């Protein structure tokens, strides 16, 4: 295919600028800047329409175009309604104490299966955790959830027997 195009509808965000291959998507929730210099994909902006055009791109380039479109759609959704993920703590004998600091930017986990060493995890920028974490970046929420799960991990313990830990219960849109 010499020319391939992908069309998307811009949301009601204030700014949909994609100048210098940087997507400065500013919506009612906030303004988020994203870099797409990794893949050389032509972009056409016309009103509320954003078109991703690949000129004789390879299969890997074609695959990245769909990935870029999903990334753009996810960024638009986050800038419009946001992303919220809820996780439920699981304990068997020793409850795990969770402390929030800096408006939820820092999470401290104590007494995790009796552990006396507190684990401190720093939340990603633009994401606030109160456990329900809400933010305008779905990727930031997902990475923070993975870090929290990694912190609350049992080492040299029976997974089938010891079910204590932290797992994400659900994840959706704030609005």
């Amino acid at each position: 295919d010499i020319y391939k195009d992908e069309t998307l509808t811009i949301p009601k965000g204030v700014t949909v600028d994609i100048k210098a291959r940087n997507v400065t998507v500013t919506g009612p929730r906030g303004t988020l800047k994203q870099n797409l210099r990794h893949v050389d994909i032509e972009m056409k902006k016309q009103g509320n329409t954003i078109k991703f055009i690949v000129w004789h791109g390879s299969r890997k380039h074609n695959a990245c175009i769909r990935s870029v479109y999903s990334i753009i759609n996810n960024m638009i959704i986050g800038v419009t309604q946001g992303f919220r993920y809820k996780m439920r703590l699981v304990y068997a004998h020793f409850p795990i104490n969770i402390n929030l600091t800096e408006n939820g930017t820092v999470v401290e986990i104590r007494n995790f299966l009796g552990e006396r060493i507190t684990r401190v995890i720093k939340c990603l920028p633009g994401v606030t955790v109160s456990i329900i974490l809400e933010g305008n970046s779905l990727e930031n929420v997902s990475q923070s959830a993975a870090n929290i799960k990694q912190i609350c991990n049992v080492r040299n313990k029976d997974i089938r027997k010891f079910l204590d830990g932290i797992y994400v219960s659900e994840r959706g849109n704030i609005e």
Binding site: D1, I2, Y3, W55, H56
Partner: protein
């Protein structure tokens, strides 16, 4: 510099065979001498007629009847591989039948490392109907929405003072 040469030949008449049949075929050769030698090898493969048993009667080159009008050409070729037995059929869009032929030879010589001796041109035909076209790339070259930037621009006067604009 390939050119399509028509070759007509027949076996040497004798008391056993007073009137030989006329065998004519169109093959692409860079010169008359190559065409005649290829024709003999083809006849030996098919009719088993030796060079001494026969003789060529007429050689003539064929120009493109409409060299200024774009066309699509489909060629059937049998190619010799490690097994020594392969068949392929390809389509190309070009303004000259020779241009299509030399284009396929380059593609065969690149994808399969094909030699001139190994390749034998089986069938040549002109593709005209839209539904006749099968290959995807030429299908993309068929729709009226053909528009794209020029690829491979890259445009001794060494040590150019300014940075090249490389744009429009």
């Amino acid at each position: 510099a390939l050119k399509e040469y028509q070759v007509v030949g027949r076996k040497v008449p004798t008391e056993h065979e007073p009137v030989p049949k006329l065998f004519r075929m169109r093959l692409f050769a860079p010169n008359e001498s190559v065409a005649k030698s290829r024709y003999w090898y083809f006849l030996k493969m098919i009719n088993k007629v030796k060079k001494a048993t026969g003789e060529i009667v007429a050689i003539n080159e064929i120009s493109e009847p409409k060299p200024l009008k774009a066309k699509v050409f489909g060629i059937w070729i049998r190619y010799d591989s490690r097994s020594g037995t392969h068949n392929m059929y390809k389509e190309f869009r070009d303004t000259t039948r020779v241009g299509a032929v030399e284009a396929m030879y380059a593609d065969m010589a690149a994808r399969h490392r094909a030699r001139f001796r190994s390749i034998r041109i089986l069938k040549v035909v002109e593709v005209e109907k839209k539904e006749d076209v099968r290959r995807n790339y030429v299908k993309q070259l068929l729709n009226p929405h053909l528009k794209f930037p020029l690829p491979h621009r890259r445009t001794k006067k060494v040590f150019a003072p300014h940075r090249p604009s490389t744009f429009y």
